[PDB]
A paper describes a structure:
The ethylene-forming enzyme (EFE) from the fungus [name] strain Pd1 was heterologously produced in Escherichia coli and its properties were compared to the extensively characterized bacterial enzyme from Pseudomonas savastanoi strain PK2. Both enzymes catalyze four reactions: the conversion of 2-oxoglutarate (2OG) to ethylene and CO2, oxidative decarboxylation of 2OG coupled to l-arginine (l-Arg) hydroxylation, uncoupled oxidative decarboxylation of 2OG, and the production of 3-hydroxypropionate (3-HP) from 2OG. The Pd1 EFE structure includes a double-stranded β-helix (DSBH, also known as the jellyroll or cupin fold) core, an architecture that is widely found in members of the Fe(II)/2OG-dependent oxygenases. The overall fold of Pd1 EFE is very similar to that of PK2 EFE with a Cα RMSD of 0.6 Å.
An AlphaFold model41 was used as a template for molecular replacement to solve the Pd1 EFE apoprotein crystal structure at a resolution of 3.5 Å. The Pd1 EFE crystals have a different morphology but the same space group (P212121) as the PK2 EFE. Although Pd1 EFE is predominantly a monomer in solution, the asymmetric unit contains four molecules (chains A, B, C, and D) with the overall Cα RMSD for the apoprotein structure ranging from 0.19 to 0.32 Å. We were unable to model several disordered regions of the apoprotein (chain A, residues 140-144, 237-249, 274-295; chain B, residues 139-147, 237-251, 274-294; chain C, residues 236-251, 277-295; and chain D, residues 139-150, 238-244, and 275-294). The metal-binding site of Pd1 EFE resembles what is found in most other Fe(II)/2OG-dependent oxygenases, with the metal coordinated by His251 and Asp253, that derive from the loop linking β3 and β4, along with His327 that is situated at the N-terminus of β7. Of these three regions, residues 270-290 are disordered in Chain A of the Pd1 EFE crystal structure.
Author numbering: 48 to 139, 145 to 236, 250 to 273, 296 to 407
C-alpha cells in the first residue's frame, strides 16, 4: 500500500466510470447519472477514466508543475497579485514545506471587471508562458468534464434541463496546484472537486476515514458544500485530508464553480414541501472564504484598504 505512515484508514473500493463526450439525454446518460449518484451517496467519491487526450494534458501540466517548484524560493515567492488571490503560497536539505500555486480566472488589467476594481478579479501571475499554456489547456479539459458531470447530475436527479449548467456559465473555475513534502480535515466550497494525483498518494475522504489509492489513468470527483446545499444533503459534502508520505507528492485540485455573479438557490424538487428562503451569493461566499484563509496576503489587505467589499452588495455583481 502507498498509504502514508502513522495513519489509520480503510482502503476505498471506488466505482470507475467513463463520461460520454456529449451529454444528449439518451437512456445511457440517465442510467449513468443514476449510477453516479448512488456511488456518491454510498462511498462519497467516484473515479472517472481519463481520455487518452486528457492524459497527455495531465502529463504536460504535471511537467510544468515540477518545473515551477524547482525554481528558487525567492523567484516563486514573487508570484503574487494585488487584485487576484491566484499565485504562490508557501508554508515555511532539499525542502520541507507544503507549497501551493492557485490559478483563478486570468483576466487582463484592461478587462471591465478588473477596471471596476471588483474583488478577486485580476491578472494571474504566471512566471513564464512555458507554465501558462499547459496549465491553461489542462483547465480547459477539466472544464469540459466538469460540465458533463453536472449534466449527469441533472439527468440522474430528473431535474429541469440547465438547472445546474446555467450557474456555471462563465463560472469562477479555479485550480490548486499542490506539492506535499516528505514526512521527515478540510472542506470544499463548490459544486464538484476534480482531483488528480501521482503514484505516491495521500488523499483521505470521509464517507456519508478512507484512503484513496492511486489508480493510473483516472481522476477523482467528489461534491462539495454548494452541492449539498442545493440538493438537500442528497449529494453530501465529502471532507478530505492529506497525509505526508515518505516521498514528495504532486497533485491537482480543480473546482467546478458557479459564476461569480450567480446566486445559488435550493432545488424545490429535492425539498419536501416548501424550500428554505435562504440564498447564497457565490461571489460573497468566495471572497469571505479566501479573506479568512489568507489574511496576511497583500490581496486581502488591498480589499480592506480600498473597501472593495462594498461592491459585493451592488446588483451588477449579483446578476448573470
Amino acid at each position: 500500500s502507498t498509504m502514508p505512515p502513522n495513519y489509520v484508514a480503510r482502503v476505498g473500493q471506488l466505482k470507475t466510470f467513463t463520461l460520454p463526450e456529449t451529454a444528449t439525454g439518451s437512456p445511457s446518460d440517465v442510467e449513468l447519472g443514476k449510477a453516479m449518484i448512488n456511488a456518491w451517496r454510498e462511498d462519497g467519491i467516484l473515479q472517472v477514466s481519463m481520455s487518452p487526450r486528457q492524459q497527455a494534458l495531465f502529463e504536460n501540466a504535471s511537467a510544468a508543475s515540477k518545473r515551477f517548484f524547482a525554481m528558487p524560493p525567492n523567484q516563486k515567492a514573487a508570484c503574487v497579485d494585488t487584485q487576484s488571490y491566484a499565485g504562490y503560497i508557501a508554508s515555511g536539505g532539499i525542502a520541507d514545506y507544503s507549497e501551493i500555486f492557485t490559478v483563478t480566472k486570468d483576466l487582463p488589467l484592461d478587462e471591465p471587471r478588473v477596471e471596476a476594481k471588483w474583488p478577486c478579479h485580476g491578472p494571474c501571475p504566471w512566471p513564464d508562458v512555458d507554465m501558462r499554456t499547459p496549465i491553461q489547456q489542462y483547465m480547459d479539459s477539466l472544464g469540459k468534464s466538469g460540465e458533463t458531470l453536472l449534466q449527469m447530475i441533472e439527468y440522474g436527479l430528473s431535474l429541469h434541463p440547465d438547472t445546474l449548467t446555467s450557474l456555471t456559465k462563465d463560472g469562477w473555475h479555479h485550480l490548486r496546484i499542490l506539492r506535499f513534502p516528505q514526512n521527515n480535515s478540510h472542506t470544499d466550497y463548490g459544486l464538484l472537486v476534480i482531483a488528480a494525483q501521482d503514484e505516491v498518494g495521500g488523499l483521505f475522504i470521509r464517507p456519508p476515514w478512507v484512503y484513496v489509492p492511486p489508480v493510473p489513468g483516472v481522476f477523482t470527483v467528489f461534491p462539495g458544500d454548494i452541492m449539498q446545499f442545493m440538493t438537500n444533503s442528497y449529494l453530501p459534502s465529502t471532507p478530505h485530508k492529506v497525509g505526508l508520505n515518505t516521498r514528495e507528492r504532486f497533485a491537482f485540485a480543480y473546482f467546478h464553480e458557479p459564476s461569480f455573479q450567480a446566486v445559488v438557490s435550493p432545488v424545490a424538487k429535492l425539498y419536501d414541501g416548501q424550500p428554505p428562503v435562504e440564498k447564497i451569493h457565490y461571489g460573497t461566499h468566495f471572497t469571505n472564504m479566501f479573506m479568512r484563509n489568507y489574511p496576511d496576503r497583500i490581496t486581502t489587505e488591498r480589499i480592506i484598504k480600498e473597501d472593495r467589499l462594498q461592491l459585493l452588495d451592488r446588483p451588477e455583481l449579483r446578476t448573470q
